[PDB]
Subunit: 108 residues, 3 copies
């Protein structure tokens, strides 16, 4: 990927009713945590949700594929996935940084 980076944010803008399917699919590949927020596409709007996950470079393709598995319906309006370089990941609780900081360690 260009830019090259140790970590990447995978940002998926998908249908709100596909949250659980994407989340469950990610869990199967060891991605235990996703961050979700409400967004609107074009007072007429289309409701979407942004799903954000930060992973190591070697996990990006698996994450993309897994999100598609959960989010795809075959109908126009399935959304888009963006990949952005992440220079650093820090765990607030411990100050751990990098690989020691990327995994989600919240309660299930």
């Amino acid at each position: 990927y260009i830019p090259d980076s140790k970590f990447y944010k995978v940002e998926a803008i998908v249908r709100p009713w596909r949250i659980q399917q994407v989340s469950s699919a990610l869990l199967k590949i060891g991605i235990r945590g996703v961050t979700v927020s409400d967004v609107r596409g074009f007072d007429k709007f289309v409701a979407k949700v942004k799903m954000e996950i930060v992973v190591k470079k070697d996990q990006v393709e698996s994450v993309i594929n897994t999100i598609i598995e959960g989010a795809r319906t075959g109908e126009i309006g399935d959304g888009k996935i963006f990949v952005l370089p992440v220079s650093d990941v820090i765990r607030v609780r411990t100050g751990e940084r990098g690989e020691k900081a990327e995994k989600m360690t919240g309660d299930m």
Copy 2:
């Protein structure tokens, strides 16, 4: 300089602007042929100022027209008009088809 660092094929143009200027920005962007803007409610400084984040991912060569157009739609002249951020995007994937890169952009 248009040669943004880091170099990337795509960039996210992220604008934090006044909530009431969103239709104006969207319309202005439509006038230059750009669609697919995503909008979300954010807040700046339990007292807050309501703002809207508008996000559009485009090719490197579209960035300057997008910046100019957002300003055109969002500027009022008063303090609090907001800011625009440009961030490198390594790839774009259309969920429906699996198309990647330029095919997936619009």
Copy 3:
């Protein structure tokens, strides 16, 4: 290292933290002269059960990043599981809407 990869003039510091720590993080940043933090509500899905968090975003110069990280931790840390994470992403440029000022003038 402070020499972040990718190398960039600016970086977005993105903190996903406990909602009740907003005021402490904002105050702490103010104490080091940092203003212009933007916040939004997010849901940690990782019945439709979730954890409420707030995403705090600030775009700063490369040389402000370490102070910003440390200050956010100071404001947001409780020591208990669930304090959240900070992400750092390169930002190629900042533009002020009112003036059209770019680069450091805008940031």
